[PDB]
């Protein structure tokens, strides 16, 4: 296949999602960010879900 860069982020502690309508990121893994307008960013994770996380937990990558 193929491995490019997307516009990703990173997570920054474990964030368990409740249900898969939400969405799941773990420490130090990287997210899909795709709304950054409100509180709880709207991404979607290595398991191609998607929800919202809280910006606790999750940040934009510094790279």
């Known amino acids: 296949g ?9 997570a ?5 999602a409740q249900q898969e ?3 799941d990121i773990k420490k130090n893994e990287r997210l899909w960010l ?3 307008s409100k ?3 709207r991404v979607r994770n290595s398991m191609n879900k998607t929800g919202f996380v809280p ?9």
């Open 2 to 10: 193929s491995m490019a860069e997307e516009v990703v982020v990173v």
């Open 34 to 36: 795709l709304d950054d």
């Open 39 to 41: 509180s709880w960013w």
């Open 55 to 63: 910006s606790n937990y999750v940040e934009r990558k510094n790279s």
């Open 21 to 23: 309508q939400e969405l």
């Open 12 to 16: 920054k502690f474990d964030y368990v």
